[PDB]
Amino acid sequence: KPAVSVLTMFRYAGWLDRLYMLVGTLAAIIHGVALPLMMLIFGDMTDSFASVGQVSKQSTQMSEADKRAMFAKLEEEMTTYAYYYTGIGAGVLIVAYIQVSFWCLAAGRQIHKIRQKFFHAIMNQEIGWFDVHDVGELNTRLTDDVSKINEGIGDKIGMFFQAMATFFGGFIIGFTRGWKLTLVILAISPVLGLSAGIWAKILSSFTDKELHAYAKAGAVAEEVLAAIRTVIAFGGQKKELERYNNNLEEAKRLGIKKAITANISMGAAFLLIYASYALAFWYGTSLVISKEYSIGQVLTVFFSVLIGAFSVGQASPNIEAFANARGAAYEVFKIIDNKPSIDSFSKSGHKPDNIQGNLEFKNIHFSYPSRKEVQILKGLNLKVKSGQTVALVGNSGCGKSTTVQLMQRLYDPLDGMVSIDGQDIRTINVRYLREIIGVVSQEPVLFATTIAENIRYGREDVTMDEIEKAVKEANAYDFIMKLPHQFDTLVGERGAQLSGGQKQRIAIARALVRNPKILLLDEATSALDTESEAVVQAALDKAREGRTTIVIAHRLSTVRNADVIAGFDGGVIVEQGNHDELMREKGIYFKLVMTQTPPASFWRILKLNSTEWPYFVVGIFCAIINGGLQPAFSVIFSKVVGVFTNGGPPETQRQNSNLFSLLFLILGIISFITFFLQGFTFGKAGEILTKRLRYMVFKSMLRQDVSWFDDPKNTTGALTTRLANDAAQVKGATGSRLAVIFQNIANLGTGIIISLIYGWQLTLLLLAIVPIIAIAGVVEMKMLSGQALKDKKELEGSGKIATEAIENFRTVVSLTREQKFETMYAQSLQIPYRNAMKKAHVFGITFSFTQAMMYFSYAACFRFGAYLVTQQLMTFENVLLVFSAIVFGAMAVGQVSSFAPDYAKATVSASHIIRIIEKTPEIDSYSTQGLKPNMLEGNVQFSGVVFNYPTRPSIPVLQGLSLEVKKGQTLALVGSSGCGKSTVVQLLERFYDPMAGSVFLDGKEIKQLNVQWLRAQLGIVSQEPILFDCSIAENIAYGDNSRVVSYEEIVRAAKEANIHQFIDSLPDKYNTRVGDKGTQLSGGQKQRIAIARALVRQPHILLLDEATSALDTESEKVVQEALDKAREGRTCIVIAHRLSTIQNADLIVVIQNGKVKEHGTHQQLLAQKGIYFSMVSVQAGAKRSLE
């Protein structure tokens, strides 16, 4: 939104820059004017052939006589015109080069300055300014915004003015050659505008409906895949697949409607374009027959005006480019124009000599820029005598640090003053102040360069001797000398990660080189290991004794030796004095003391589309007829101007131009039939396979087992996305693109056949020229990307040293040496700067060469078109035909290059979609194999089972687990913690086969048993039951598939589950919707519904997994009552966490580390003393506490 003043933006342009811009925009305007002058001559050429074309056919008597005057006229005229063209070529070459080169130059020269000034401005900001801003956004703002600005002040302007120049230059010739046709065109101009609007409105409609349309299927797919274990357990896969297939079925219908309308519209638009232009040209001829206009003039104004007309559209994008740049520049120039209060880049204020270092803090009130929300320091008074060392203590709020924060003048205080020596801190120079003060901070930071350099960031002028004495005086010499490379060893975030204490020591050395009069140590000893703490503490103690010091930490080991200790309460200074005094005071200090003591490319995807033999041949035959229909307009436009040029006696002309102009339209309407067809056939073809793919993918996705669904690689979202995208992407490749390609190769094919069979060696000549300028076009774009990629790599290094500077900034301000990062940033910038100078040089040559080649090509066109060919009996009407045909054929071939990435993307997307289908599981539910035992009564034999979850084959859940439970008795399962209890239920469901061991039910191994039938006998009830959106009767009826469950049956199940109180209470009753779409319920109801769902199946084995887990008060009572009523008639396994409710169980089993530890009935496990007794005794304590 926000822009900047146009003059302010260019403030860094002066002298040569403004000159470059002037000469550049001048040359650009010339370059612009150049083109419409080309079409002006094109009319004159037509007149030359027209004069002769008429006289030649008017004779019908003498032959040789026509070999003299005509050829002479053509000689002089064609020579003149060719000379002119050759003239224009050099012009466009020069002006193009000048334009692009100059503007790119100016751009670079400015952006350099912008960058430097901007970074300086960043470094010059006071910390209070950083506290209120995000540094990441700011660095990214730098790197991105400056680029935006560069895009804005670049050659785009030249293109804009050139475009405006073609616009004016076009309409000027357009008007001056004649007024009528222009006005006649400017009427169909809106008519064209209306059709584009309609087409936009139609695109906006289906976007929204499409999102709504698939979201119907995508919603089903998401609740299913999220419910995967419940649909697997209850084996409703077929149903879910059915639903998904239905939603797809709808989607495809909406899709074919989409296609139909879209195609109709496109066809209509094409028709209106055909009609309008054909109509304009007809009016043209109608004006030529009156002898009011020349046949060539019509062309001149027509082409000049249309050129000028499209110039606007082609111009518009550069506007937005400059407009955004002003906006990007706003927030950029905002920092540069911002003058702070503190500066520190200023040379000002006293730089005192012989500082004795007497500090005082007088009545200081302060708050950080969270402002009024919190005021941390309410008043203050403090003094620290010269040479002394004061230690600040406090419970919380870190009002301690604030003094260190103020003593550097990182902030000015709200009220009060901090005074070093006698003078106010604000009078003395900021830098000098930062220089006379040394600082050691809790988390030390080391910039990435040799250790010497890090010690050199203390002072720019230093020798390795001073470094040595510095580190040795910090006792860091040993540890670093043992390190390889000596002082040349690397440090940083990347590489050579060292001990905190060592880094701290290096920081103390760095600080020590500063030879500061004032030392500030904030929790440097804290947040460090106890062993190295003394090592660093020695250094810290040796860092003093030359200086006055304020220290802050949580370590009261280091405070005792201090001359004065100062406690704070609520920002208020209270206790001050020597240790013994503070201990005699028995205040806060004493209090704290006592307190602290897979690629591929293949067509099997197409072989899937081979389901439809038709719907393709139709589209391609249609699209090839379209491809054959396309050049036919060229052939007409050739002969309309051609016969008119070749007319001879005029009487016959006016009758023919009406026959052509008719036909001219006739190819139009017939185009409506074909274009809609090929669009509809490919469209409908697209929407059906989209059903088959998403159907086969989804289906095979329900085939995969739980082992695959636990994968961190595959989650519900990722699966839905992979499901949607691939199917959506394969449609694009198999869709319109292919049709268009066939249409275009057909187009160029018929075109080149016509052009070739008409022109002899004319076409052969052109086919030599056209590819070269095409390839020359492609090689340019390659260099552009090359220079682009290289430039990105060079500024990345400069942005990397920027990020290092502004991320650690609060450190760099303390050490000063910002000018260092300034210089390094500059030098880092210097290389891209020279690169940007070369860029202009190259961008020009490449551009101009591509302009000149096209213009020079246009010269050889009519020069060979005339002379050798026209001195022969070959004619102008054929030349005009060949050029149209060929060049348009090429411009059709362009769409081939344009459509290239679609297939690649679609192939990468088609790669997965086949693999996902072809993937088979270890356990597939679809196999009709398996025993299907005839005997009802169940048992469960777990024997020597070992299990590790495929996702985490590290910590084994089960090791040699063995259980037995007879029929019609409850198996209670207690455990320390983990899924070891649940893995039983998971394995009995056979979501996994165990690594070793086996499990039987009727005495038959479930592994060789049918999977479905196995799962069909199971009554699974989990913690938080998921209910799909549908009637609660349908949720309950989900308990049994392959058969529809009776109403009285689900009633019985609901009566058994004691949910009937709810179901009869509702207005809809059993038909009520649940699942959050139509209604909301609490846990109790959902669970009882899960119970109903469980026992409507009439399972021989109930499985209750922590059923009461999320639940409270009477809900647990009623649900437990239901569950209790549910069992005792069936085999079941209850892992529930309430042991008081397990107190009645046939067999209790304690599991330990995968091995069954304790076993037997309650009173037995109670008789024994061990884990279970502890399990029951510990959770009784909570009850006793609650009582």
């Binding site: 055909y274 499209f310 396309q630 307009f633 060229s634 436009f637 149209s884 045909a885 348009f888």
Partner: peptide, 6 residues
Amino acid sequence: XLXLXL
């Protein structure tokens, strides 16, 4: 070349 065929 503009849009019909030239």
